[PDB]
């Protein structure tokens, strides 16, 4: 039935909530969370980071099919996000909330990944937003790395270094998948949820919502 959240929205389903979608050109279904009551309305949360919840340091394959319930935080699964993107043309909006008591987003004009035999290389273009003037996600998208997914450029392994899977450069200005640190421990931490250009290298965000749409 429903491929992505836009199709849910246009189907008048305008209500923030969990929905079941189906892979394009296939008969496989992957559940997720749609953010209708939001911006334009109709976003497909590919990830959230609201509290401790379930970790992220997981098998490369786990970051492949996804993990975590969509009720709270989760990752959905690169493969779905990989195909679901080359179908049409999607953007990407990254929104995060800090402890002190602020919040900002970042909007990419176009986003998509690649073949598993290409390590799901990310590609982001046309950057806008309030959380930076420079793409916090390492330009020239690198391969997605994991505990056992050394496909980065550090002469070392950023994943085992920064905890969790992410498009690490030689350990870039970002990693939204890194040890959820509490209120009074949200500073001078390396393996923490950081988006650099909006806070600091030592900051560990309190919230982290990554979501996508096409151009409805």
């Amino acid at each position: 039935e429903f491929r992505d959240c836009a199709e849910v929205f246009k189907s008048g389903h305008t209500t923030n909530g969990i929905y079941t979608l189906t892979f394009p050109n296939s008969t496989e279904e992957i559940k997720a969370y749609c953010d209708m009551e939001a911006g334009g309305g109709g976003w497909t949360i590919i990830q959230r980071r609201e509290d401790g919840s379930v970790d992220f340091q997981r098998t490369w394959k786990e970051y492949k099919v996804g993990f975590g319930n969509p009720s709270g935080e989760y990752w959905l699964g690169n493969e779905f996000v990989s195909q679901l993107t080359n179908q049409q043309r999607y953007v990407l909006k990254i929104h995060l909330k800090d402890w002190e008591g602020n919040e900002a987003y970042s909007l990419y004009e176009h986003f998509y990944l690649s073949s598993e035999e290409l390590n799901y290389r990310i590609h982001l273009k046309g950057l806008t937003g309030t959380a930076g003037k420079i793409s916090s996600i390492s330009q020239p998208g690198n391969d997605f790395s994991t505990k056992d997914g050394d496909n980065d450029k550090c002469i070392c392994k950023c994943s085992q270094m920064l905890t969790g899977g992410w498009w690490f450069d030689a350990c870039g200005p970002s990693n939204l998948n890194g040890m959820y640190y509490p209120q009074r421990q949200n500073t001078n931490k390396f393996n923490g949820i950081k988006w650099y250009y909006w806070k600091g290298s030592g900051y560990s965000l309190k919230a982290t919502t990554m979501m996508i749409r096409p151009a409805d």
Partner: protein, 423 residues
Amino acid sequence: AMDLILINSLPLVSDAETSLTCIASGWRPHEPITIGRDFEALMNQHQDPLEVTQDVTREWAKKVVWKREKASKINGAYFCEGRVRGEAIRIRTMKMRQQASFLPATLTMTVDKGDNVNISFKKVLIKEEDAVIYKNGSFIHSVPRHEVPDILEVHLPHAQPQDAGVYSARYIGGNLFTSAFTRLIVRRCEAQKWGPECNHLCTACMNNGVCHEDTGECICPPGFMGRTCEKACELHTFGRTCKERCSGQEGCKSYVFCLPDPYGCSCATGWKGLQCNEACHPGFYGPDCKLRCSCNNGEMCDRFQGCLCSPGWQGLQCEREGIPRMTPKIVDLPDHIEVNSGKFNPICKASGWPLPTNEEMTLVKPDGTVLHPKDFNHTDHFSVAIFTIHRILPPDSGVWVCSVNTVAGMVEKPFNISVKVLP
């Protein structure tokens, strides 16, 4: 009461041998001299036993030499104690790969409570990686690969004392020992103020000398003495009063001196450098030649002493005429004594035109107690300070030292007392 002087044979370790030397000049320290890794400062340091053999070029000092090619686990933070009557005294430093990737542009940095400071790092062997700063062995922050400064700074406006330590710098991927070190030293009070609550003024010091915010005196730079450090020692000397000759032929062209923490580690007056291999451009002169000769009537600026005014005039800059000041001399003092257990009144009589005062005159017991005069005399020439000691008994025998320190220099002369017992 305790003149310790740690020596760092070039903090930048290479294929060549390096060493540490903790010299105690003046006092025959009782509590044994220590040397070793200052584990607290640079944390996560590897715990290796470093042999501390004795040195025989100077009267009382232990050394630590890391033999060529063997110099592998030498990076980090070392120090060395002294200990006088129950109290302490330590001097800290660092040892780092000469190679590495960055370079401190200075080993130490002294500031007063509330100075905006810039802990820098010269980028040298640029790699396709990220930058990371590490205080004490703890992570602070990093710099993203594509925008890594040229002179990697670290800004801390209004530095407090608990904000000092050892800031490091390494390209993300690399040993916690391939890092580059540098110490920042903040003192409890602000410039020129010392005190149990910083409500007293420091004995203003010249020739780049720092002031101990615990006592009020200055820790002169290796090359000058005097209550204000205005006195230019013998060319190529060092030591609380100068009685220590820099060894190596070219003056001190390779010694990085370190004094008690309120000061730090600077080259000896006359050399610029990180290894102090460089003499000084004309016009400047102090330690690390941070001193600019503002010699008035255009006099010779000596890269060690300063201005060499014409006869008839003296002054840091020759800005004053007057009878030339002559340092003190502890005159007329026996080498032995032989006294009987009882009321005892030692006396130090000392010369010098800037003439000492009981403020400036002491007598130091062997164990290290400082003793002040009970009554002061005075005369045409020479100051007579009489000390009084309750009941001096046999165990006090040893080597006492009359010590005078005015604004024209410091001087110590020992004598051997031998309290016997009356039948």
